[PDB]
Amino acid sequence: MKIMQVEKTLVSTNRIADMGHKPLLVVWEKPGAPRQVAVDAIGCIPGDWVLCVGSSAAREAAGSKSYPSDLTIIGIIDQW
Amino acid sequence: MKIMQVEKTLVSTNRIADMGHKPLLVVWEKPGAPRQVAVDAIGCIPGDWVLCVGSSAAREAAGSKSYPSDLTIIGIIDQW
Amino acid sequence: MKIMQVEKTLVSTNRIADMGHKPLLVVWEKPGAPRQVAVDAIGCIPGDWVLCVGSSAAREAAGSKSYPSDLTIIGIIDQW
Amino acid sequence: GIALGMIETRGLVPAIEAADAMTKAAEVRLVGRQFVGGGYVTVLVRGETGAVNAAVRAGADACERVGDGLVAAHIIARVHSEVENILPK
Amino acid sequence: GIALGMIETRGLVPAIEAADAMTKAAEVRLVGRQFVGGGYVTVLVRGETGAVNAAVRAGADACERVGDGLVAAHIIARVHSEVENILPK
Amino acid sequence: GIALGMIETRGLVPAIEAADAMTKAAEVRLVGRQFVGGGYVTVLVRGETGAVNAAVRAGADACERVGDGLVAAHIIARVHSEVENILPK
Amino acid sequence: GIALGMIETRGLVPAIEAADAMTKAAEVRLVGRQFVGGGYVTVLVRGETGAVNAAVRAGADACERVGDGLVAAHIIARVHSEVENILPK
Amino acid sequence: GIALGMIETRGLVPAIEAADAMTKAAEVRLVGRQFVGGGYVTVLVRGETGAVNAAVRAGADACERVGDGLVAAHIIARVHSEVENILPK
Amino acid sequence: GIALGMIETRGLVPAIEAADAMTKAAEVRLVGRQFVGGGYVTVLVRGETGAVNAAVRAGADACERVGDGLVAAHIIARVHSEVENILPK
Amino acid sequence: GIALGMIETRGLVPAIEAADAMTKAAEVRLVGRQFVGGGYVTVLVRGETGAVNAAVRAGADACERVGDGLVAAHIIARVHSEVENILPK
Amino acid sequence: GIALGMIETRGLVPAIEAADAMTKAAEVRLVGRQFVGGGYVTVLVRGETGAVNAAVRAGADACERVGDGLVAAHIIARVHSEVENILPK
Amino acid sequence: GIALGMIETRGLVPAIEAADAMTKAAEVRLVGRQFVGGGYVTVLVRGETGAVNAAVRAGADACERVGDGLVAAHIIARVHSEVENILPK
Amino acid sequence: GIALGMIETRGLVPAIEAADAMTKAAEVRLVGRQFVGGGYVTVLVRGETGAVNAAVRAGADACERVGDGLVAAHIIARVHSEVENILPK
């Protein structure tokens, strides 16, 4: 897994219908790294340090085992 | 997921028969990055900022759960 | 997917018995990049520009869904 | 901008959960929490159309299973100038 | 003019939806929203008779399937001068 | 904005009903009405993605029950420049 | 005033009958007759709200039993400013 | 004078047969033939009330068995001044 | 280049969806949209053989489930000089 | 020469296919494409008698399985001088 | 610290029992008691994530059996800044 | 204005009851009371169209259950200039 | 171009039918006919990938029903230089 930091939120009005109702967040390693997008299964604010998992693991961690995802937030780090 | 930008379209007349009828697009992170090919499940024009997923997640996002893909476009970013 | 170029062919007399009868080719991004090995499901000559898929997608694209592969050629680009 | 999202629940715990989910899911501003009477609580957010849509969907999915539960979730993409007299600021 | 339309709902969300439908559907002015207690909310509009009929019909039809639903709708083509003390302005 | 929403109906009365419902429900601009032939009428609106989404849903729901009914409702988030020639302005 | 009534029929004979009944039964102005295609004909009137209700009811009742019959009738008590572009004058 | 008779048929052959029968059966003037769409054709004559009555009866009896046949036949003894805007001259 | 692809649908909504899908799926130029009558609409594109093949496949798969649906999709890899007189430019 | 071949189809796609097949299969000249209405499209060719037989047979066989299909095919080995007024050039 | 724990009960006696159990079980700060309406009482505590976890578990177990019982128990690890206005200090 | 409402009853008592209900329920003027013979009594009111609708509905509903009952109720939104000779002032 | 299409048939008449269908259907160049022995005839064409694809499909469909029929149809997008020695020019 990875230690990421949240920047902000992202909206796409036309997503496929299987993406459900879940939110999306922009995350990097450190400010200035390439930015990625994760589905948020916890509820996080900008400036948080979070744990991200990406694989079929991420598919099942966000929703069910056929969910269209490859990066999911699964926890908030207590101290970083 | 990744935030990509579309360059153009790609045609391969001899593809395997399981690739279906779907279109193909060329995408980079930023202009000058390495280029990749994604299957288009939305319908996008050059100059767009898009959301791309790649894994078995991408397989099921494009068509069925045995589709031969590992990079699929699943949405258009409203403002980027 | 990836846009690859073919160098040459590779032979290994002692492969595992599940690899079937399929050929193998050496591919790079551009001449001088790290070289990789793909299974050829189309039939390609050196100097071609090809489409390569790698995942469980590649497993099923080359042969059956339990084939031992992680990079397969699935088409030839008409103009590149 | 101008667009209104509303969630109504039975009790205050799912209402606070829905408000937090909305404001973490999109760029919207919370304008009101209301006790209606009889155990009904209502939360109102304002923003752009796409942001309000995304926020209300996330909030409903969040509070679906907390406490007594969700009563209603609704998006209004543009509101008449009369209704601005009864909406809170 | 002087003609009164009233709609009563369970909860605030159907009340807001119904009020919006009324004000979009006719040339009426929204004069009051009230919480009765127990989860009842009442919305009051004023105008010409035909305008009020159109507005009340549109509001009832819109809010019938939202939230906990509609309780009542009513039209009075002219009210007594005594009721103007207990009606809001 | 740049986003297209289309509704197709059997007859002109449900088409006018749908166009009115759209323009009241969202901030979109009406660009065209078209007689296909055989009794088909199409209405086209332009705007932003969320506004067009909301308008098309509202219009489909409104015109479903009028006359001969609804045939099709569809949204396109952005359009290729080639289609601009065959789209009315 | 600004209230719109619409009747759609199969063929021109019931349309003419309905238009005549409307104009005899209320104080409305006839603003348009249109051929859709496939045998659909639509007639449009403008006036006050109560006048338009009376006219539309009389026209539908008159033309229900003439020719191939009535397809639809509809009243809109006020229309958006956008629809005035596609509405004939 | 002022009186309007109309016949509608399926196809042009029964329509021409009906028009000829009308003008041979009374002292009326033919003001219009219209293609409506979908295979409907309408014929309109003008005159005195008794002449229009007799002409329309004869025309219907003539065209009832020709081609695909008669759809409708109608007499209006006096027409509103509004409908004169959509009637041909 | 010289190659012609054509799609025919029932209604204008699937036709516009197909045209957009074609032009986003390949490097082809749109030369015509035609109303044929009875509710048939046809879209024609021109280009190279492989581009036209890919475009027509994508367009058919796109419009198969929209509205009333697809009637026909066809590719002609080279066309006689006589047919160029009836093709639009 | 002066010999006429005709093919009538449902829709424009089978008509284009049939015309192309005709012009590839014989030495004929394509003189007309016409929309009848209701979705009928007719294609007309001129030439020698044997050329026209070959062309009409090839066109019908090609287009029988495209789109909505073939309606009719016909050869006339010589036409009257009167028909040249209604025949396109 | 910054973490919110909430319990909602039916009546005030189980709420006071729950608040006492929380404050004895962990190091949290009690920020508010709220009467919702209809007999609902809510208690809110703040602290660190582990302390709030432990406190909410202890309080739910304590108040489960008193009076009318427990309605809801919930933890939020950190709250968005918009919710801070509607939360008591 | 010029819109007529009529109610006919059996006996004078339901007639008086209905007239009182009409005048309290709308802004109408009472122009006539007539004894037909055989026990029929008719009451006539004049006003605006919506006013007359409200008044006639209130009168019929009031007098249905009094005396020997209601026979008929009718609204005419505008009457011919000829009928003004036989209507009382 | 560099792309090879081949068809094999039982007899020479279906081979000539197939070759004619190919060269009419696409822009390919015919390079060879071969008698294998035992009654097999093979026809080879060269060109671009899309044109060769289209030609081989057209040829297979054309020759499938003539004589003894079709044996094989195949496309190769590009060939190794070693096979160029055994292919005809």
For chain B, the first-to-last Cα distance in angstroms comes to 15
What are L's interface residues with E at a Cβ cutoff of 8 A?
25-27, 48-51, 53-54
G-interface mutation test, from F10, F13, F28, most G Cβ less than 10 A away: F13
> Is K77's Cβ below 8 Å from some Cβ in A?
yes
Tokens representing K43 are 């208690």
Q: Determine the residue among E10, E12, E46, E89 to mutate to test chain D binding: the one whose Cβ has the most chain D Cβ atoms within 10 Å.
A: E12
Range list of H helices, chain D: 13-25, 49-63
Q: Count the Cβ atoms, other than its own, within 10 Å of residue M2.
A: 14
Q: Which of I8, I9, I16, I64 should be substituted to probe chain F, the one whose Cβ sees the most F Cβ atoms within 10 Å?
A: I16
Cβ neighbours of B5 (radius 10 Å): 18
**Chain L environment of E77 (Cβ under 8 Å):** 25-27, 50-51, 54
- Which tokens belong to G37? 């295609």
Chain D CA closest to residue A44: D24
Q: How far, in whole angstroms, is CA B70 from its chain's centroid?
A: 9
- Please, do chains C and B touch (3+ CB pairs < 8 Å)? yes
The values of phi and psi at residue C40, to 5°, are -105, 110
Min Cα–Cα distance to chain I from B21, Å: 6
Q: Are E4 and E44 in contact (CB under 8 A)?
A: yes
Å between L25 CA and nearest CA of chain E: 7
Contacts of C42 in chain M (CB under 8 A): 77
Please give the single-letter amino acid code of residue B43. Answer: G
CA L51 from centre of chain: 12
**Among candidate residues H35, H27, H28, the one with its CA nearest the CA of residue H9:** H35
Minimum-distance CB partner of I13 among F8, F79, F80: F8
Closest Cα in chain L to G27: L78
A interface with K, Cβ–Cβ < 8 A, is: 42-45, 48, 76, 78
Considering only CB atoms, which chain J residues are within 8 Å of I42?
A: 11-13
**Three-state secondary structure string covering H22-72:** HHHHCCCEEEEEEEEECCEEEEEEECCHHHHHHHHHHHHHHHCCCCCCEEE
Q: How far is CA C80 from CA B10, B40, C4, C53, in A?
A: 9, 20, 11, 18
**Any A CB within 8 A of D54 CB:** yes
Residues near L65 by Cβ (< 8 Å), separated by ≥ 6? Answer: none
Structure tokens at D25: 């899911």
Of the candidates C21, I56, C37, M77, the residue with the CA atom closest to the CA atom of residue B16: M77
CB distance I37–J35 less than 8 Å? yes
Residues 6+ apart with CB under 8 A from M16: none
Distance from CA of M36 to the nearest CA of I (A): 31
Q: D5 is written with which tokens?
A: 């999202």
Tell me the two tokens of residue C45.
């000559």
Check if the beta carbon of residue B51 is closer than 8 Å to that of residue B77: yes
Nearest CA in chain D to F54: D77
Give the closest of B45, B76, B78 to F80, CB-based. B45
Q: Which residue has the tokens 């009167």?
A: J82
C-alpha D45/C-alpha J89 separation (Å) is 69
The encoded tokens of residue E48 equal 């010409």
Q: How far apart are CA J9 and CA J16, in angstroms?
A: 10
Closest of M50, I55, C52 to residue B9, by C-alpha: I55
CA distance L48 to chain G (A): 9
A53 backbone φψ class: left, alpha, beta (φ>0; ψ -120 to 50): beta
Distance of CA C77 to the CA centre of its chain: 14
Please name the amino acid found at residue J2.
I
Closest Cα in chain A to B40: A16
Closest CA to J6 of J37, J36, J39, J30: J30
Contact between C5 and C36 under an 8 Å Cβ cutoff? The reply is no
Query: Using a CB-CB distance cutoff of 8 angstroms, which residues of chain I are in contact with residue F71?
Result: 11, 13, 67-68
**In a mutagenesis test of the I interface, which of B21, B22, B37 is the best target, namely the one with the most I β-carbons within 10 Å?**
B21
Angle at K33 between CA K30 and CA K39, to 5 degrees: 150
> Could you tell me which of H72, H40, I41, E53 has the C-alpha nearest to residue J39?
I41
Contact pairs from chain D to chain E, CB under 8 Å? 67
| For chain M, counts of helices (H) and of strands (E) | 2, 4
Query: Residue G61: is it exposed, middle or buried by C-beta count within 10 angstroms (0-12/13-18/19+)?
Result: middle
Q: Is residue M58 a contact partner of residue M28, using CB atoms and an 8 Å limit? A: no
Choose the closest CB to K36 out of D24, D29, D39: D39
Nearest to F24 among G6, G74, G80 (CB): G80
Q: Could you tell me which residues come within 8 angstroms of residue B1 by beta carbon, excluding any fewer than 6 positions away? A: A24, A36, A37, A38, A69, A70, A71, B51, B52, B53, B74
Please, which residues have CB within 8 angstroms of residue L46's CB and are 6 or more apart in sequence? L1, L2, L3, L4, L5, L28, L29, L31, L52
Q: Which residue of F has its CA nearest to G75?
A: F17
Neighbouring C-beta atoms of residue K24, cutoff 10 Å: 11
Cα of B76 to nearest chain F Cα, Å: 8
Residue of E nearest to G80 (CA): E24
Cβ–Cβ under 8 Å, residues G87 and G44: yes
Phi, then psi, of A2 in degrees rounded to 5:
-125, 150
β I70-76/A36-40 pair status: unpaired
> Does B43 contact I24 at a Cβ distance shorter than 8 Å?
yes
CB contact under 8 A, B48 and F80: no
Give the domain range for residue J44: 1-85
What is the count of structural domains for chain K?
1
Quick check: L60 and L18 in contact, CB under 8 A? yes
In this structure, what DSSP letter does residue C19 have?
G
Q: How was this structure determined?
A: cryo-EM
Q: Which residues does D14 contact at the CB level (< 8 Å), separation at least 6? A: D63, D66, D67, D68, D69, D70, K72
Which of F7, F9, F16, F33 is the best substitution to test chain G (most G C-beta atoms within 10 A)?
F16
Q: Nearest CA to CA, how far is I34 from chain F (Å)?
A: 10
Q: Which CATH number characterizes residue I32's domain?
A: 3.30.70.1710
Which residues have a Cβ under 8 Å from the Cβ of L89 and sit 6 or more positions away? L31
